[PDB]
Nucleic acid binder design. Sequence first.
RNA 1: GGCCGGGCGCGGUGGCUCACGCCUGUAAUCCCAGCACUUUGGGAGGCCGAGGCGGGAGGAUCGCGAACGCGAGACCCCGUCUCUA
Lengths: 76, 86
Amino acid sequence: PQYQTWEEFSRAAEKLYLADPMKARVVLKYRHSDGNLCVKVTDDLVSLVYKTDQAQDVKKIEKFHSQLMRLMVAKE
Amino acid sequence: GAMESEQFLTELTRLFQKCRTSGSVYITLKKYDGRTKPIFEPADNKCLLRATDGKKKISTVVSSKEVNKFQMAYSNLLRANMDGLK
RNA sequence: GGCCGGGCGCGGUGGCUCACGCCUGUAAUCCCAGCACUUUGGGAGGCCGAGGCGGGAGGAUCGCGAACGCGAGACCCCGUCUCUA
Ligand SMILES: [Mg+2]
Ligand SMILES: [Mg+2]
Ligand SMILES: [Mg+2]
């Protein structure tokens, strides 16, 4: 579902990734014309979504996206 | 099409620019194990990125060996191009 | 025999492919404008698996009647049938 609280999404999204890294995907969608940004983490069993039009969330979403990328390339 | 991570960043910038007046920029990030056929030696230090406006597609693979430089440019790219929000 | 995508809206077609808008998949790209063709035409390159149907109270998402009740649904899952260089 959609999350209205960022930190709540962040925590659930990270949990979902860690549960099975290979099954997860992280998707960003940016619409300049509409002035909104969307981030999703899904493993095709659940879809965690955070949608925003607040500029402060861009840094939050970018760091989030960045952190998950670093985890993906860290060898077990 | 697939390309080196550095060219991906250049083409990603162009995609954002093309979709400034209209359209969505999609970016997908996943862990990548090096497979090239349906399901070798699986890779454990790589991810893939894809970007598209739904018509044009670009993709790359980023390894632990290039993640630092890639992150630096990529994070800067995202912050600079996603400037339409309030 | 195939896979290298799909859905909705809008335009279009007997219909498919298709343009635009929107929502999105793959480890799996770039193209042509065609087509006994309803599992929907073709080229380069790659690969061995792939698709139909039914169900999903898995699931973003897109819509409708309204000013609560519904529909469709990428991707995924289950059942089942069929095809193979
Ligand atoms: Mg598909
Ligand atoms: Mg075609
Ligand atoms: Mg359902």
